[PDB]
Design a binder for this molecule. Structure first.
Ligand SMILES: CN1N=C(N)c2c[nH]c3ncnc1c23
Lengths: 111, 381
């Protein structure tokens, strides 16, 4: 129980990053709904619609990558246990969303 | 919007800068993203054309249709050794239209080709709009810089880029001349001043020697490397860490592009820290195969990893003094230009080469050219 005010500053940065991750995760969810929409919604139009979703998944992957890069600027002393735990969990959350992004890429613009 | 003053624009290979002389001083103008320098990048998408920061930010997403390095093509013929060698690296297409190079892209779902001066005009239009947004006034008159070695076709092509952008190009001045102007080296007492300009920025390395007599510039020699900069130094720290990760975890992170990028981005930031500190730390969580990478690097190791690249900068300096028929003792002023001149080792080697002589380095190295071009624009109009 040695929580410092200095750690509050670091936790605040991570919280903002968590909010940015949820915004990008919502865009991924909408992309998923659109994908479901195309695959069962009445040729060359389908291909154009899926490779338009491709640009959008690529944009989603890029936003998740720029979040990781911002997280990688953090230096958290070993005694900032709460901040190190929160940073570790957010990286893992982003990495699981990237694996989902990759699955969408594995299913679209294929031959 | 009322009538605005004349501006100085440094049209770089990777980044451009715009300055204005007002209230007895030059102010370097920040763009819409608050950056004092703007990427010389143009992106062509399914619905829009992006310039600057907006174009650089989606390069990963749209590599084929994101044009950069138009400065390496401007005013050249298609069969130029430079055009044939440089296009090997570029992810976008460079085609031939009657002996002239043209960048071929996908714009609004249609195949389109633009001349290098048309691409530079779009960058110049952005620099003009950046100036207009800051001053809240219309901007027409401008001085644009070019490297001293640029020929007649390269110089006219840059003037055409400014004309297509709607600018009245006052003069095309040499980048080393602009840097020398920024430091007011032409207003110093004496008969004749020999100036060496050391320019290490935006992917190229340029050494120029100039002579100033009663404020008149003469280009004595030029030497350098058209492919040398921060990216090469960054590459050396990336290899160092990849090797460290192999020794500690017996895992090769090199084929995982995302892992390499996270490490590269951390290295580019660590290199900046090492210009003001003697050590930099990096903490990357779940870098590769869920393994956390927490490490550090000292300035000494960083210098050691790049020892050849840093010492190698001196050779062009030797070549320029040889062509200019001058001894190193004959050099009156040394000017440091470009972001990588911030590196203490490069500064140490250049002061040790010129026997403890002081360097002109107080003006921001990435901004010195735009600074002098702004001084020149306020005189010309
Ligand atoms: C501190 N700093 N800041 C920079 N903006 C920069 C660009 N290239 C550099 N090389 C070394 N050190 C740098 C830089």
């Amino acid at each position: 129980g040695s929580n410092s005010p200095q750690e509050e500053v670091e936790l605040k940065k991570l919280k903002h990053l968590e909010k940015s991750v949820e915004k990008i995760a919502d865009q991924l969810e909408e992309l998923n709904k659109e994908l479901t929409g195309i695959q069962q919604g009445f040729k060359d139009l389908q291909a154009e619609a899926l490779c338009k979703l491709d640009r959008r998944v690529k944009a989603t992957i890029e936003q998740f990558m720029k979040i990781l890069e911002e997280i990688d600027t953090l230096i958290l002393p070993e005694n900032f246990k709460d901040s190190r735990l929160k940073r570790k969990g957010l990286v893992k959350k982003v990495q699981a969303f990237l694996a989902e992004c990759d699955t969408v890429e594995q299913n679209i613009c294929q031959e | 919007m009322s009538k605005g003053p004349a501006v100085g624009i440094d049209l770089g290979t990777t980044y451009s800068c715009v300055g204005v002389f007002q209230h007895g001083k030059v102010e370097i103008i920040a763009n819409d993203q608050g950056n004092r320098t703007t990427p010389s990048y143009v992106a062509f998408t399914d619905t829009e054309r992006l310039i600057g920061d907006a174009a650089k930010n989606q390069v990963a997403m749209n590599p084929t249709n994101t044009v950069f390095d138009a400065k390496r093509l401007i005013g050249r013929r298609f069969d130029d050794a430079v055009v044939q060698s440089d296009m090997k690296h570029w992810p976008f297409m460079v085609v031939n239209d009657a002996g002239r190079p043209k960048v071929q892209v996908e714009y609004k779902g249609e195949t389109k080709s633009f001349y290098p001066e048309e691409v530079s005009s779009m960058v110049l239009t952005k620099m003009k709009e950046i100036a207009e947004a800051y001053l809240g006034k219309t901007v027409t008159n401008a001085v644009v810089t070019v490297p001293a070695y640029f020929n007649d076709s390269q110089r006219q092509a840059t003037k055409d880029a400014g004309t297509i952008a709607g600018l009245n190009v006052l003069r095309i001045i040499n980048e080393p001349t602009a840097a020398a102007i920024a430091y007011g080296l032409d207003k110093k007492v004496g008969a004749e001043r020999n100036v060496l300009i050391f320019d290490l920025g935006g992917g190229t390395f340029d050494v120029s020697i100039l002579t100033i007599e009663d404020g008149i510039f003469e280009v004595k020699s030029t030497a350098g490397d058209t492919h040398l900069g921060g990216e090469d130094f960054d590459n050396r720290m990336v290899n160092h860490f990849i090797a460290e990760f192999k020794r500690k975890h017996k895992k090769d992170i090199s084929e995982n592009k995302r892992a390499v990028r996270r490490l590269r981005t951390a290295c580019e930031r660590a290199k900046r820290t090492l210009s003001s500190s003697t050590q930099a730390s990096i903490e990357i969580d779940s870098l590769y195969e869920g393994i956390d990478f927490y490490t550090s690097i000292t300035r000494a190791r960083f210098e050691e990893l790049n020892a050849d690249l840093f010492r190698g900068t001196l050779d062009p300096v030797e070549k320029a003094l040889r062509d200019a028929k001058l001894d190193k003792s004959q050099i009156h002023d040394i000017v440091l230009v470009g972001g990588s001149t911030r590196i203490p080792k490069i500064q140490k080697l250049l002061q040790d080469f010129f026997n403890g002589k002081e360097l002109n380095k107080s003006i921001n190295p990435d901004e010195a050219v735009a600074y002098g071009a702004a001084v020149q624009a306020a005189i010309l109009s």
